[PDB]
Design a protein around this nucleic acid. Structure first.
Ligand SMILES: [K+]
Ligand SMILES: [K+]
Ligand SMILES: [K+]
Ligand SMILES: [K+]
Ligand SMILES: [K+]
Ligand SMILES: [Mg+2]
Ligand SMILES: [Mg+2]
Ligand SMILES: [Mg+2]
Ligand SMILES: [Mg+2]
Ligand SMILES: [Mg+2]
Ligand SMILES: [Mg+2]
Ligand SMILES: [Mg+2]
Ligand SMILES: [Mg+2]
Ligand SMILES: [Mg+2]
Ligand SMILES: [Mg+2]
Ligand SMILES: [Mg+2]
Ligand SMILES: [Mg+2]
Ligand SMILES: [Mg+2]
Ligand SMILES: [Mg+2]
Ligand SMILES: [Mg+2]
Ligand SMILES: [Mg+2]
Ligand SMILES: [Mg+2]
Ligand SMILES: [Mg+2]
Ligand SMILES: [Mg+2]
Ligand SMILES: [Mg+2]
Ligand SMILES: [Mg+2]
Ligand SMILES: [Mg+2]
Ligand SMILES: [Mg+2]
Ligand SMILES: [Mg+2]
Ligand SMILES: [Mg+2]
Ligand SMILES: [Mg+2]
Ligand SMILES: [Mg+2]
Ligand SMILES: [Mg+2]
Ligand SMILES: [Mg+2]
Ligand SMILES: [Mg+2]
Ligand SMILES: [Mg+2]
Ligand SMILES: [Mg+2]
Ligand SMILES: [Mg+2]
Ligand SMILES: [Mg+2]
Ligand SMILES: [Mg+2]
Ligand SMILES: [Mg+2]
Ligand SMILES: [Mg+2]
Ligand SMILES: [Mg+2]
Ligand SMILES: [Mg+2]
Ligand SMILES: [Mg+2]
Ligand code: NA
Ligand code: NA
Ligand code: NA
Ligand code: NA
Ligand code: NA
Ligand code: NA
Ligand code: NA
Ligand code: NA
Ligand code: NA
Ligand code: NA
Ligand code: NA
Ligand code: NA
Lengths: 202, 148, 57
RNA sequence: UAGCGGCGAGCGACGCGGGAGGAGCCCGCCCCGAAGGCGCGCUGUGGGGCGCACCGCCGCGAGGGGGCCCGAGGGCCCCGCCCGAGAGGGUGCAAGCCCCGUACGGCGGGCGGCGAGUAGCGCUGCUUGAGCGUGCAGCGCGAAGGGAGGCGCGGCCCUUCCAAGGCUAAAUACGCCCCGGGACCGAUAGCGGACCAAGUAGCGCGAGCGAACGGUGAAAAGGACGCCCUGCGGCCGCUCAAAAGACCUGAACCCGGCCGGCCGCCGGCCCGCCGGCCCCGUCUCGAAACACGGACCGAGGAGCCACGCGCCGCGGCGAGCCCGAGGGAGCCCCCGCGGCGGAGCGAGCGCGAGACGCCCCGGGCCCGCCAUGCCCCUGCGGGCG
RNA sequence: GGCGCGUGGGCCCCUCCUGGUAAGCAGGACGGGCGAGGCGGGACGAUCCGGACGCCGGGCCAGGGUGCGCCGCCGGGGCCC
RNA sequence: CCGCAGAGGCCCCGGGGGCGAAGGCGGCGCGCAGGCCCCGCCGGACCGGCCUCUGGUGCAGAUCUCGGCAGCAGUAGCCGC
RNA sequence: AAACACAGCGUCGCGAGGGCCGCACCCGGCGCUGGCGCGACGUGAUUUCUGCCCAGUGCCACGACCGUCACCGUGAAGCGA
RNA sequence: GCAUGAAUGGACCAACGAGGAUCCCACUGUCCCGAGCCGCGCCUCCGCGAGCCUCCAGCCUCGGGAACGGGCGAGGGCCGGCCAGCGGGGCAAGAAGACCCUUUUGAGCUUGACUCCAGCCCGGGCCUGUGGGGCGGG
RNA sequence: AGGGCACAAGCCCGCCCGACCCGCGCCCCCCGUGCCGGCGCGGGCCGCGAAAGCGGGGCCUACCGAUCCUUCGCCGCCCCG
């Protein structure tokens, strides 16, 4: 008696004719080398400007990644007003601007205003009157301009008496009451009308 | 490697282990899973109960990050505290400097009640608790809290 | 084209090839079909016996 | 993995997350009105929002003799030199130092205003995972604030965006042709096609079909002279290390001469006597069969690879584990998320495990689903059984 | 206990049966054999009588036989186209 | 376990070779065997024992494919005009 | 060939805005035609004849609209489907 | 009258027919019953020179055996090599039986098989104007 | 068709609807799968009888049917801003 789990793989399509549906990866090392060469050439062409732009810090979407940050597309106009800059100037000094995005809370605005202030503190501009030597002395930045770092959680301390004042002495009853409130009201309403049938007939 | 395979040890024998009376033909029973209720009914009934038919209601698009719900048992709580702080907190069974643990920061939503706890007060913040989890926590001197 | 209908010619020899297997020694003491009132009383008498009760403390 | 599916066989997306790359804008409508691209154009040219605030080219390029013996040594013995060059190819036999190359260079390149036979709806056809409709289309009807939120209809909210006009680099794909490489084939193989003439010779009214054929030697040195012969040819010798003489080597089947024997295989023997022996492969209850295939010889000739599932063995780590894509100029070095495991059951709202044990089996308890009794707070909610 | 292959046309003997005038016919049953079992014998045979097998030397002997082919025999009692 | 083709190593002054490699023909020896080794003649430039790795890896058959070729046989036949 | 054709015999449809056929569409043939015509069928020179059946199936009614038989349209109910 | 019959035409019929059938005259190797002859081939020679087929081989009788042997058991015969003829054997050769059956293998044709499509007929709407009138239901 | 049955399992009379609700196990056929059929139980509610008792139909061995779809019934859950 054969006892197996059934396969869930689709039959192949277009094997001897039609479009080519097979992808090989023999060019992986060559693609690596080519991408690096392109990056190096482009960096040489714009020295000493960094390859990347400064981009905002945003929260990851759903409830599953709620408490962490990543890199976003561009800063909103409210943040720029917080630092007193225009979209033209921001794009001039290497800042990404996204007028499609809207802030949903003040904590995001504060975080990104602080980010902009740091970047402006760390940025230097060269005039067309600067001699060629001091331009040669500049260092070209690598990678992401200022990476987003998520710290690991720590353990704090509190008072048992203070915490005992913030919850009822039967918390499970409290939680189960809030979960069932909508369905318990539906039963009550249907029961009251069922009583109106008792009196309406007499 | 082909040197060590069983097929290479059948050269000189004529039918290669498939028999004389039967032989090796193409598809003597059909292709795939065909015949499940007909000539393969015995096989399907012995090993695959609940293969045919429908059952339950259907959702046209499941929202995958709404149904997500990780849980932690009350006996894994103290492992979230590093060892040095661990011995420090255990030594002083303080009621004014009790450790505070927020399991949501570690990636959990609900606290269940399998296992036991060390005898020492502690504060635990979560979004939901089980009935027994709260009972065991309060018998060791701790208090549960709800965190945004 | 007719073929044979039935034979038991070789079946007794095949049965004895590895001996006649006896049942397991746990099939004799199963509770599979015993009277429920008897089974319930047996459970409660054991639990209240201090010398054979598995209740903790 | 939601779903579609004689709910059978089968089929099947997207979001969130991690990377490569990164760039934004215009027209109409509205204001001015020929200021314009002036033989055009007012049936609208031209200009504007109005108030608050890596490729190619060129070059140079080191270092060995003596003896023995061979048709010729790159061979054998002895003793040396060069090295940013001991990748290779050629040369009369295995060459860093006999020749060309290889390593090391240089040059050039507040106001105004947002798109109609349209969107949508009814009926019908195709299409999709899209399920009382995923996208499109025909016909009929046809608008003002409008669209969407993976089950329809009516009502009230919230969250989000503005169709029926237009432009845009990068990260991605890929044959011919050119360059480089290979645990690939080695002349019945490899492309049909290694051959001064292949899509050729040849076949078909035509659309089309389509072969076979590689190799003397270091050097053509490609065969002196002489003697027979009516000529055709023959002998003898010549070149060469060798005829290797239209050519490397030259097997099997089949055959001619000379020389020895008299019927196949196995066994015994002082060798032709004695004894034994049906034709293999195959389907079949059963083959020596008047069952089929097989004249003979050579070469070729048939369970490999990819993905999925189950179980077994071994290695590393272990409540954890993990060369993902990719990034660092290191095929082998460094960094590098999901995922799977860690808790189950339940159609679902959801609820959620400790009590025993070297191991195994079995009992006993605990969690979820179903049904009940008692108690009580915050109550079709909690607790105990 | 786990994983897995082949097989799923059978036939014959002994004794016991059913249909059929019968059949080297068709269909069943306990045990054995051939299939898949070499060797000696039954003149000759897949199955009968003995005996179930590595390569050899020696001995004993089952079944069946002992005029000659062709290894191996006599004695006694009875019958005899 | 024997054998075939190829890859990475070893082969005590750096494995065997025009003082003659591969291949062919004939003959001993070794091994239960698949096979291996040596000797003589031919030939004229390459070859491989052991350890690890890899596979388009072993033929008597397929009315098998391609090539060569026998008996039949000095046979049938070389009769229209 | 006893098969097919044949002259002859008979039936059926159509007066052009029609009939029969082609044809994806646009458009065509009979038709440079008009009932002494065109198209569709059966029997098969001459002579002599060709009986009965309209229950079945088929065809036909400028027969009839009895019952049934669509979308559309319109009436009632409904928050709307 | 198994089971004739009237344009699915009945009956009859002169002329005609490489049509099917019976008889008579004449004629004859069709025959009784075969004989003789002519030319070409065959046959022998010089020149030239193939195909098919082929497990191996090639004498019989009986037995047993896949129930009709060249080979096996038991008997009987036979130097070896060739020619002209011949048609008893070699279950002679020529072809994966066309008859019969099976396969969840086809195709041609038919229809009152089952599921449908062109075509045609019929109704309403759009194309689609400008006037008058009748009837039946609000 | 074969078994069974005598103050009865037959016949007559009286009252009734156990020809019920919830949940398990076993037997037969058998791969120890399904289906039909039967039997043994734990609870609820009932009938008859003075009571003990018996009753999940016609004394026993035959009298019948999956997935998908439709329809009906109790109590609840979902339509995912
Ligand atoms: K057969
Ligand atoms: K035959
Ligand atoms: K006619
Ligand atoms: K009629
Ligand atoms: K005729
Ligand atoms: Mg073979
Ligand atoms: Mg099979
Ligand atoms: Mg076979
Ligand atoms: Mg059978
Ligand atoms: Mg040089
Ligand atoms: Mg060289
Ligand atoms: Mg717009
Ligand atoms: Mg489709
Ligand atoms: Mg919704
Ligand atoms: Mg582009
Ligand atoms: Mg070739
Ligand atoms: Mg011999
Ligand atoms: Mg002999
Ligand atoms: Mg076969
Ligand atoms: Mg067969
Ligand atoms: Mg047979
Ligand atoms: Mg055989
Ligand atoms: Mg070969
Ligand atoms: Mg079979
Ligand atoms: Mg028989
Ligand atoms: Mg067999
Ligand atoms: Mg046996
Ligand atoms: Mg003797
Ligand atoms: Mg040479
Ligand atoms: Mg190969
Ligand atoms: Mg061969
Ligand atoms: Mg001749
Ligand atoms: Mg009649
Ligand atoms: Mg008539
Ligand atoms: Mg007639
Ligand atoms: Mg023969
Ligand atoms: Mg013989
Ligand atoms: Mg003849
Ligand atoms: Mg003959
Ligand atoms: Mg056949
Ligand atoms: Mg055939
Ligand atoms: Mg069948
Ligand atoms: Mg068909
Ligand atoms: Mg009574
Ligand atoms: Mg009861
Ligand atoms: Na060759
Ligand atoms: Na050579
Ligand atoms: Na035999
Ligand atoms: Na056959
Ligand atoms: Na043959
Ligand atoms: Na246990
Ligand atoms: Na024998
Ligand atoms: Na050799
Ligand atoms: Na091969
Ligand atoms: Na006529
Ligand atoms: Na046909
Ligand atoms: Na039954």
């Amino acid at each position: 008696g054969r006892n197996v789990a059934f396969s869930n793989m689709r039959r192949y399509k277009c094997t001897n004719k039609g479009p080519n549906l097979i992808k090989n990866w023999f060019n992986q090392p060559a693609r690596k080398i080519r991408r690096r060469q392109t990056r190096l050439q482009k960096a040489k062409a714009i020295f000493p400007c960094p390859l990347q732009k400064l981009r905002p810090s945003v929260t990851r979407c759903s409830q599953k990644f709620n408490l962490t940050q990543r890199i976003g597309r561009g800063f909103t106009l409210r943040e720029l007003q917080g630092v007193g800059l225009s979209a033209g100037k921001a794009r001039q000094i290497g800042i990404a601007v996204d007028p499609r995005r809207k802030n949903k809370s003040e904590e995001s605005v504060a975080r990104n205003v602080a980010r902009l202030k740091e970047y402006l503190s760390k940025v230097t501009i060269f005039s067309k009157q600067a001699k060629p030597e001091e331009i040669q002395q500049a260092i070209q930045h690598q990678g992401v301009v200022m990476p987003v770092v998520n710290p690991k959680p720590v353990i704090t301390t509190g008072s048992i008496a203070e915490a005992k004042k913030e919850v009822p002495e039967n918390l499970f009853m409290y939680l189960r009451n809030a979960r069932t409130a909508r369905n318990r009201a539906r039963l009550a309403k249907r029961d009251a009308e069922r009583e109106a049938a008792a009196k309406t007939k007499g | 490697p082909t040197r060590i395979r069983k097929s290479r040890k059948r050269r000189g024998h004529r039918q290669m282990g498939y028999g004389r009376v039967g032989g090796h033909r193409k598809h003597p029973s059909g292709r795939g899973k065909a015949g499940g209720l007909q000539h393969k009914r015995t096989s399907f009934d012995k090993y695959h109960p609940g293969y045919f038919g429908k059952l339950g209601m259907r959702n046209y698009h499941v929202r995958r990050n709404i149904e997500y719900n990780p849980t932690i048992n009350i006996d894994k709580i103290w492992s979230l505290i590093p060892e040095e702080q661990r011995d420090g907190f255990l030594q002083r069974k303080s009621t004014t400097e009790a450790p505070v643990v927020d399991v949501t920061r570690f990636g959990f939503f609900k606290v269940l009640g399998r296992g036991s706890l060390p005898q020492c007060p502690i504060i635990i913040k979560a979004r939901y608790f089980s009935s027994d989890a709260e009972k065991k926590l309060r018998e060791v001197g701790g208090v549960p809290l709800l965190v945004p | 084209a007719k073929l044979k209908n039935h034979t038991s010619k070789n079946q007794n020899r095949k049965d004895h090839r590895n001996g006649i297997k006896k049942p397991k020694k746990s099939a004799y003491t199963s509770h599979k079909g015993m009277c429920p009132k008897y089974l319930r009383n047996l459970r409660r008498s054991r639990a209240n016996d201090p010398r054979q009760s598995l209740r903790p403390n």
